[PDB]
Design a protein around this ligand. Structure first.
Ligand SMILES: [Zn+2]
Length: 29
């Protein structure tokens, strides 16, 4: 099961899908 909870900005590992989206939404300055 290829990990899909990875951020395309810093490869950050998210515990879920929602939190992950929130991370990327601001991961960009
Ligand atoms: Zn990120």
């Amino acid at each position: 099961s290829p990990p899909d909870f990875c951020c395309p900005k810093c490869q950050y590992q998210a515990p879920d899908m929602d939190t992950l989206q929130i991370h990327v939404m601001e991961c960009i300055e």
